[PDB]
Design a protein around this ligand. Structure first.
Ligand code: SAH
Ligand code: SAH
Lengths: 228, 228
């Protein structure tokens, strides 16, 4: 009888990159959870599912717990606490909640922060996978990531681990690349092997930018793909 | 006027894990390329997609070239040369061909072997991203893969590189897992960190099996997920 928490991957931007399953959950759940920063009117995940939500003859309740960009670790933790409290109030009343996530819910989505709390409160949890941004970026660039015996590495940051590991991998995905392109260029280009590098911003959206090398547009939604 | 080649990710098994975009392509292309071994009536990719194809009003031609069951010998390359000729003959006649691929076409897919040849012969090529099997596995397991500054490693087999790189990553995907889990287990167990492990066979299919730790013999479509 409890509501369940469902982590729903929404894909990289284009509504046509939602899965049939995602579309089905989102057309049916009574509650959607789409967290946002303080100066956002709506998260990017909510704007992706806008048309679906407004197509609905039935009403959907939107939970949009606020996450200030300025939170220190303790305030962030406390803001996840109250997010879980508003979500659990829905599940306590028998209503399923779909937590929408850009791309796929298993890849840097923040889903686990809510998920751990909700399962600790004794509720049940599910996940719907999606097109992750990095395979969508490979697709738009007309490029394959890995084949045969090649190793893929996915990083959110340029760090010392990244540097010492790089020679033992054949391809790598660099997330948040508007913050990370410069450091990334330096590390990858010091590698003696031939490399093919491309960066993609706003993949699958109207303002998508494909650029050779370690930069594209400077917005939050940029990813770099490296193949050796 | 010449047709174009489109690499279409079909997801891990469940037809509901298709994107709307893949559906759209699959409903309208005149030709589908779905290579197979002789021991199969249809590839796994074609069986995922069969109900879309049967339900079309407008008929579809299937190219299903047989490849020798071998991972090993560049006996495969002469077979790709002949399949590319087969595909090019459709493109030359102004017919689009969708090459369907399990999961996503950028991730250990066979698409790149056909793509390079078709592009070398002077035809246009496109990709439609899909739900990749490793994130679909994480979703069925109810586990997220990476958050925050965690680093993800995806490996097709477990060799010396895996061992040397492990302590520098926070999560790893082991593909073809029914064969590699033995050496994988030992490496993972000897890591000093707390860890959880889950193995998923036939993710999203009727006969999906999920079990904690290194499950030992899940057949071809089996993946192991490790988080530290
Ligand atoms: N549409 C898009 N185009 C390019 N990169 C994108 C993108 N959407 C998300 N990203 C990438 O994802 C990062 C946010 S972390 C969220 C990742 C998401 N769960 C996924 O599966 O893709 C961004 O910094 C960027 O690296
Ligand atoms: N339905 C499924 N369940 C579990 N693993 C799967 C799977 N489908 C594919 N795989 C994984 O993929 C490997 C074949 S490599 C093909 C990968 C595919 N392009 C994708 O994106 O997922 C298998 O050895 C297995 O590790």
């Amino acid at each position: 009888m409890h509501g369940k928490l469902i982590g729903v991957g929404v894909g990289p931007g284009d509504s046509e990159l939602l899965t049939l399953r995602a579309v089905n959950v989102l057309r049916s759940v009574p509650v959607i959870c789409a967290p946002r920063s303080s100066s956002e009117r709506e998260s990017i995940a909510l704007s992706i599912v806008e048309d679906i939500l407004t197509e609905r003859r039935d009403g959907c309740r939107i939970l949009d717990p606020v996450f200030p960009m300025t939170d220190d670790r303790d305030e962030l933790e406390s803001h996840w606490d109250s997010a879980a409290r508003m979500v659990a109030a829905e599940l306590e009343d028998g209503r399923d909640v779909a937590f929408i996530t850009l791309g796929d819910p298993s890849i840097y989505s923040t889903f686990s922060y809510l998920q751990q709390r909700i399962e600790d409160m004794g509720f049940k949890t599910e996940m719907v996978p999606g097109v992750t941004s990095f395979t969508a970026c490979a697709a738009t660039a007309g490029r394959t990531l890995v084949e045969g015996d090649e190793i893929l590495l996915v990083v959110p940051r340029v760090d010392d681990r990244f540097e010492r590991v790089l020679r033992d991998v054949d391809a790598c995905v660099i997330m948040k690349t508007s913050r990370h392109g410069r450091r990334a260029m330096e590390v990858v280009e010091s590698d003696p092997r031939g490399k093919d590098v491309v960066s993609v911003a706003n993949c699958s959206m109207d303002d998508e930018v494909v650029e050779r090398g370690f930069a594209s547009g400077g917005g939050y939604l940029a990813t770099t793909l490296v193949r050796f």
